[PDB]
Design a protein around this ligand. Structure first.
Ligand code: CDL
Ligand code: CDL
Ligand code: 8PE
Ligand code: 8PE
Ligand code: HEC
Ligand code: HEC
Ligand code: HEM
Ligand code: HEM
Ligand code: HEM
Ligand code: HEM
Ligand code: FNM
Ligand code: FNM
Ligand code: CL
Ligand code: CL
Lengths: 377, 75, 241, 377, 241, 75
């Protein structure tokens, strides 16, 4: 049998064909491969955009226009790439939520580099949104890069060193395009290490109980379910591309960047609004920035906060409710982030901001200790 | 990695299975399917719905206040 | 930081998910832009050739390009000169740069219109409501000379005098050039200017929905087919006693 | 011992530390790692050039100028990248020559993808030399792309489809920059499969005899020899960068591209001159192109031409002489390729061209059969 | 397709591997370019600020930039206008485009000189030999009016009249402005124009050689140190009998 | 891959080795080194040199012809 002994097809076999997998993993386990597909789509649409895009402020806005009007089928490539990025962040957030609800974070190595995979995608989509060089691109790029000015002593030096000047200008757009090109390949490399550590143990499953007593081969059972899921992923993408391309995009980005005046109200893309809300919830520069970093780096210390003698929340009602109060709370912070710093959105943004950190750090750890005592162990 | 034949130990368990060409891929899809969906939502609705209703109430109040907070008063 | 009034939703014939633009109204809308708007507003990203096969023939669009003079060169002596437009030329800019534009428009800058529908919330609903929505200032608002009251514009004070009115032009097909007619036709054209792919994307969208309506249940059926071995499997535990 | 059980450091251990290696591999085995270093250098210098380069004909020439004059230490980055590419091709040609002389091609999988690694580097350096958009860049790009017009029936369609027009212009420079960016990462992926198949067997050695009876660990013995070799690789590069940057570069490339007249005599970079000579040796369009393809694809069928009962040429004097007549013959074709199609360089170019294919296909296969009979087996 | 005569190698003081440019000769060479060459030849890639700290002070180079007028704008009225140069301006182009240049130079195009030494085989040896190498045509060669014989130019017929001669300018430091002097100074400046990094790269080159002369034998010594276990190992074969 | 302890079979072979801190890294570098380089070049020069001398002769002849082939003749 050559499938099991060829040094190249051996690694494919042990990952997609004869890999033992649990027999009961639900649709929430489909998002791992949809992330891979999303990445592949962003490579290909991204690559075919880079063959017609130019990286300088004078014609960066116009080269994207040139794609949507003049090159054959470039407008569809461009909206696939724009909406593909948003589908990427849908899958990312389901992927993480699956890991929290069902306790998959106990795979420390897999989980802790998963956090790294989250940061690098954010850094990618950030440096992608700058490239069309619209108004939102420019000033969104200005707010973000100035976060480093809050670091004491060395702040301004790192910002102007990143900028290559005294503000985001021609030098930034060129290097950001270079970074946006190369990072998605680094991502693919780390995603391969994601799987390598994963296969060390195999998948968790909805129950949190070892599935060694009842495994099925990945092929044909999860190859076909991953196809079906991908076909629903294409459906989601194409509905956005072909019936609502500017639903998630802001209108202000359709006016060339102006370094002299801002829009009266700026809002990130939806997938960053929850974190922008946390930033604005503090009337301090360095405080807001640190609260923004810990908002995402909180994931790295979830495994240290596991108190339950059970792994999944499937059998933990009191943790379920606190889990869904976090989704609603995160859905609240997303709403505030899309609204102007005005009454009562300000005070709401602070209460939802505490509730975020309060749930993860206090309410959920102690909630697991209670239900352990309710079960007499 | 991990292989079949080195996973775990099992004894005295029998599995009967039928070929996929001998049976129906959609058996009682609506006859047994819908009652199972009702049981599944019934069993979890109280754990999921409240926090999202709580969000709905904050969302309408906050906009309702903001939408009129910039109205003018006679003073 | 003023109060805002947002535009209502007008029933454009291209509003629906599968509904194409009305190309006769586009044709009329181009005539509005040329005769009325092009003297203050640029369209830096539309060329005469884009009209071919949408609302004018190639011969018609060629004749249209030659009705204006554009700069070309250098010739063999190193001098710039003027010749009539061709299909490959972009629509002439009314001003060489925005600084001249502010000076010619009491300090205000008419924006480029290539993307105007996409760069403002409400699209043609906003533009239609703005053009047709001028009215006398309410009691207590006194605008400085040079500015005009328009309740849909942010701040309600706009530097553009009402640009359209009954009979500003006559349409080629005899359609009465009423203010509302002119607004409807120019708005349809501006949608096309900002989204020329509009009709083609909806035709693709229809094909995408039909293929998905086929492929989703068939792929679902393949999943259920393979999985049926497991979904109907039966277990029994028979330990020794 | 964690070095042997951590799933990540396991793969490093079995490749650079505890990997068994022969005890007698000479300096000709140093060029494998120098290729890796060369690749890393071309990534880094390449990346830092891409942060200041612009990809359109109007300012593509000027952006490279902008690097060599205005950006801090960009001129040294740029000559490192230009001369790094030439060092890459030195190492490539030593690497292959090592494989032929010592018979390493019997590792079919490793060898046959090595051929693929040669083609992709050529395709990279080709699409790199176009980017500065000088005269040699433009017309060298014109001669090459028109090779596809020789394919019957579908020739012109593939050329104009590659071009994105009716000649090499703005559309080509943009996509060629996109291809030049992404290909060196594909190379690194295939270089990893190069090693994977290699480790299946281990290294050959100067004798062609199995070294299983006498192996030494790769560390510290070949880690230090690879360092020493790399330090001599930096020496070669820096002598070119800091004392002779325009020795291999042609002067004509310092004039912006002109699509209306050619230079009276065009010459590729040195690492392609031997193959350009083979192309010009035939007064036929399709004939010259096929003779050019087979000039490199001849490597794929070397293993089928092995007749000796011994593996290395160390004990085969009659094959040694034919091997060095091939290096001289290849050194001859390099000279012709750098000279204008005029008497007597024309007829010399044809005789050296036959001698190339005559040696590989006839003289060396039969030369191995002789020396087998001289040794009575 | 004519016969060629290649230039000999002159002993420039920057010829050696570690030898820097002579910056006084650069200074004189800039004066030649400004007064004589800049009226026909552009230098699109050199700016006044590049002179600072090489051959002129900042104050000197600023005063030099203000001696010419350059275009700037738009102002608030949308008009272009002229102001004196500043350090950030590139050297003024003599013609707006090459078509005007051919018309002003009997059809020939004086190339940009920013890179001239690097875009022709022989560099300053070629340029020095060309400028100083004009002579009467040999017997039997009759050049059309407008063209000038120069044996170093390909084809021996060049569209540039001899541009330098005794006393075309006076140098600031009193140096006799002989043809050969003028050629030597302008050639040194043109090398600097094409390779401003010249001196710095040689200083680095010296440091690179010295570090390598240290690191190569030390790293060699580490290799031999570890390998000595193997290079002096002794083997013996003792089979049972 | 391949590991130490699974390579091959060896019997009755003794290896003596000295520590690298007990011996000299450059022992008789010129005393024994140069005579060995002479033996190595002597042993291979006849197999390497001829084809590159053959190239040298073609190279000088070809340029010598070309360099003067474009000279003029009285006819
Ligand atoms: C962004 C993209 C996100 C991708 C998500 C990945 C999803 C995935 O990969 O798994 C699909 C996963 C597969 O479900 P399954 O294989 O049937 O097994 C479900 C369990 O066995 C559960 O067994 P069950 O008996 O409880 O199943 C209940 C039954 C649903 O029961 C019903 O009959 C409800 C329908 C009410 C309609 C009333 C009309 C009378 O099946 C479903 O739950 C699927 C609902 C899809 C209905 C589509 C219309 C047909 O669930 C789905 O969502 C199927 C949707 C496929 C579209 C079919 C369109 C035709
Ligand atoms: C593009 C970059 C290409 C990279 C190539 C990679 C080279 C590599 O990794 O292996 C170096 C490889 C290491 O040689 P090895 O470790 O000595 O072992 C040689 C065999 O054991 C052979 O044993 P042996 O006793 O026959 O060795 C003869 C002895 C050379 O014998 C001599 O003494 C000839 C020197 C004549 C000078 C007369 C003055 C009195 O050593 C050599 O052959 C190396 C020649 C380097 C001489 C540098 C001046 C010291 O060969 C070299 O080329 C060494 C060059 C290192 C530079 C040292 C500068 C101080
Ligand atoms: C940091 C990013 C912030 C960005 C803001 C994004 C806006 C949020 C918008 C909300 C969309 C919610 C998606 C719909 C979820 C419905 C779940 C449901 O129907 O069933 C509950 C299910 C219970 O099922 P059991 O597994 O316990 O057992 C089954 C026995 N038959 O239990 C499960 O299925 C739960 C599995 C996990 C669900 C994933 C959703 C969470 C998304 C964000 C999490 C980020 C946390 C840092
Ligand atoms: C396709 C690309 C074409 C591009 C054209 C490039 C221009 C060519 C310029 C020529 C430079 C030659 C480099 C110097 C080689 C010197 C070799 C020598 O000194 O020793 C011969 C050696 C014999 O040693 P043994 O291994 O037999 O045993 C040793 C016992 N003490 O035997 C060996 O060491 C030989 C090992 C292999 C040498 C590699 C050189 C070949 C380069 C191109 C080959 C391409 C073929 C397709
Ligand atoms: C065709 C009849 C026209 C349409 C459609 C629009 N205009 Fe104009 N315009 C003019 C000025 C001086 C301005 C700047 C006003 C300011 O910045 O305060 C404008 C601006 C617009 C806008 C932008 C509205 C916004 O920013 O929200 C739109 C949508 C617009 N105009 C539509 C001047 C003139 C003008 C000079 C006499 C003419 C003929 C037109 N505009 C015509 C049209
Ligand atoms: C400073 C004294 C000068 C130097 C140094 C050079 N020139 Fe000129 N130049 C002029 C023309 C009309 C041409 C084009 C000639 C043709 O294409 O046939 C040139 C060209 C050159 C070249 C290029 C030589 C080559 O291509 O091999 C060089 C190196 C050069 N020039 C050096 C005209 C004029 C001119 C107008 C009166 C002046 C003042 C100068 N040139 C000055 C210099
Ligand atoms: C580009 C980014 C990512 C890719 C391509 C990716 C891909 C995958 C895939 C294919 C799986 C196995 C199949 C599955 O469970 O769906 C998986 C599992 C997992 N991932 Fe990711 N992932 C990414 C990011 C992340 C992030 C952001 C996190 C957490 C913060 C994470 C943590 C995990 C964990 C804990 C598992 C194990 C789940 C289980 O087996 O129960 N990964 N990932
Ligand atoms: C995970 C991978 C990626 C993500 C999430 C991503 C995301 C994005 C986003 C959100 C934009 C903004 C689009 C817009 O506002 O119009 C963008 C633009 C762009 N991306 Fe990417 N991208 C990815 C990979 C790539 C790759 C690999 C390339 C090229 C090789 C690429 C090339 C481009 C280009 C040229 C643009 C500018 C054109 C445009 O704005 O449409 N992207 N990207
Ligand atoms: C980017 C391109 C390449 C890289 C990074 C690379 C790297 C390496 C390395 C590190 C080794 C093992 C160490 C050594 O023998 O030096 C090796 C061995 C080998 N390579 Fe490559 N190589 C490349 C291209 C090629 C090419 C172009 C060929 C042949 C046409 C080739 C054929 C081989 C063979 C046959 C071996 C085994 C040599 C032996 O163990 O005796 N490779 N390569
Ligand atoms: C094996 C890998 C590579 C090789 C052999 C290579 C080779 C070359 C060569 C020969 C040139 C022409 C330089 C000149 O004539 O001035 C060039 C230019 C260039 N390369 Fe690469 N390159 C490699 C990888 C890369 C990568 C990975 C990047 C970017 C991420 C890159 C970016 C550039 C750029 C921007 C230029 C134009 C600037 C210039 O001409 O110096 N290269 N490359
Ligand atoms: C660079 S502009 C930008 N990049 C995005 C896509 C992004 C930011 C951060 C991380 C990932 C992606 C985003 O939402 N914005 N907009 C924006 C608007 C206001 C403030 C900040 C960003
Ligand atoms: C694209 S111009 C070019 N690219 C090089 C670096 C190259 C060509 C082919 C393969 C790898 C690298 C090369 O030598 N030339 N020049 C040149 C001059 C005349 C004819 C062809 C090429
Ligand atoms: Cl756009
Ligand atoms: Cl250059």
């Amino acid at each position: 049998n050559i499938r099991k002994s060829h040094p190249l097809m051996k690694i494919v076999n042990n990952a997609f064909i004869d890999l033992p997998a649990p027999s009961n993993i639900s649709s929430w386990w489909n998002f791992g491969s949809l992330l891979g597909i999303c990445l592949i789509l962003q490579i290909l649409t991204g690559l075919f955009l880079a063959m017609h895009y130019t990286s300088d402020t004078t014609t960066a806005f116009s080269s994207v226009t040139h794609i949507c009007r003049d090159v054959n089928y470039g407008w569809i490539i461009r909206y696939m790439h724009a909406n593909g990025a948003s589908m990427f962040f849908i899958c990312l957030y389901m992927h993480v939520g699956r890991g929290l609800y069902y306790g998959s974070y106990t795979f420390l190595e897999t989980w802790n580099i998963g956090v790294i995979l989250l940061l690098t995608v954010m850094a990618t989509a950030f440096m992608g949104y700058v490239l069309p060089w619209g108004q939102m691109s420019f000033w969104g790029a200005t707010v973000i890069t100035n976060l480093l000015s809050a670091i004491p002593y060395i702040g301004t030096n790192l910002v102007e060193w990143i900028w290559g000047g005294f503000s985001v200008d021609k030098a930034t757009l060129t290097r950001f395009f270079a970074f946006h090109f190369i990072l998605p390949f680094i991502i693919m490399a780390i995603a391969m290490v994601h799987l390598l550590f994963l296969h060390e143990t195999g998948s968790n499953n909805p129950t949190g109980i070892s599935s060694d007593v009842d495994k099925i081969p990945f092929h044909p059972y999860y190859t076909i379910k991953d196809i079906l899921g991908a076909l629903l992923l294409i459906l989601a993408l194409m509905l956005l591309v072909l019936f609502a391309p500017d639903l998630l995009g802001d209108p202000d980005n359709y006016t060339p960047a102006n370094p002299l005046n801002t829009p009266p109200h700026i809002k990130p893309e939806w997938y960053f609004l929850f974190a922008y809300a946390i930033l604005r919830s503090i009337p301090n520069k360095l405080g807001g920035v640190l609260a923004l970093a810990f908002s995402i780096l909180i994931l790295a210390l979830i495994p240290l906060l596991h108190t339950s003698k059970q792994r999944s929340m499937m059998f933990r009602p009191l943790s379920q409710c606190l889990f869904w109060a976090l989704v609603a709370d995160l859905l609240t912070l997303t709403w505030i982030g899309g609204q102007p710093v005005e009454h009562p959105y300000i005070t709401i943004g602070q209460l939802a901001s505490v509730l975020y950190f309060l749930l993860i750090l206090v309410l959920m750890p102690t909630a697991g200790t209670i239900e352990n005592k309710l079960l007499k162990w | 990695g991990r292989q079949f034949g080195h996973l775990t130990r099992v004894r005295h368990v029998i599995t009967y299975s039928l070929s996929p060409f001998e049976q129906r891929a959609f058996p009682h899809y609506f006859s047994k399917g819908i009652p199972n969906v009702l049981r599944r939502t019934r069993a979890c609705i109280l754990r999921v719905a409240p926090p999202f209703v709580a969000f709905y109430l904050v969302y309408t109040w906050g906009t309702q206040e903001f939408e009129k907070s910039k109205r003018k008063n006679p003073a | 930081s003023d109060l805002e009034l947002h535009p209502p939703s007008y029933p454009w014939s291209h509003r629906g998910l599968l509904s194409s633009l009305d190309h006769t109204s586009i044709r009329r809308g181009f005539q509005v832009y040329k005769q009325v708007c092009s003297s203050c507003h640029s369209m830096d990203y539309v060329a005469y050739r884009h009209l071919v096969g949408v609302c004018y023939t190639e011969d018609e669009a060629k004749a249209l390009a030659e009705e204006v003079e554009v700069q070309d060169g250098p010739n063999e002596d190193g001098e710039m000169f003027m010749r009539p437009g061709k299909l490959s030329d972009y629509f002439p800019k009314p001003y060489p740069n925005p600084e001249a534009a502010r000076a010619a428009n009491n300090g205000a800058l008419p924006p480029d219109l290539s993307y105007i529908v996409r760069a403002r919330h409400g699209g043609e609903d906003y533009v239609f409501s703005l053009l047709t929505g001028y009215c006398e200032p309410p009691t207590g608002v006194s605008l400085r000379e040079g500015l005009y009251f328009n309740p849909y514009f942010p701040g309600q004070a706009i530097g553009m005098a009402p640009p359209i009115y009954n009979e500003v032009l006559e349409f080629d097909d005899g359609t009465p050039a009423t203010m509302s007619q002119v607004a409807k036709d120019v708005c349809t054209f501006l949608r096309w200017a900002a989204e020329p792919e509009h009709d083609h994307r909806k035709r693709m969208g229809l094909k995408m929905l039909l293929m998905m309506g086929l492929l989703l249940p068939l792929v679902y059926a393949m999943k259920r087919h393979k999985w049926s071995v497991l979904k109907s499997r039966k277990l029994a535990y028979r330990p020794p006693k």
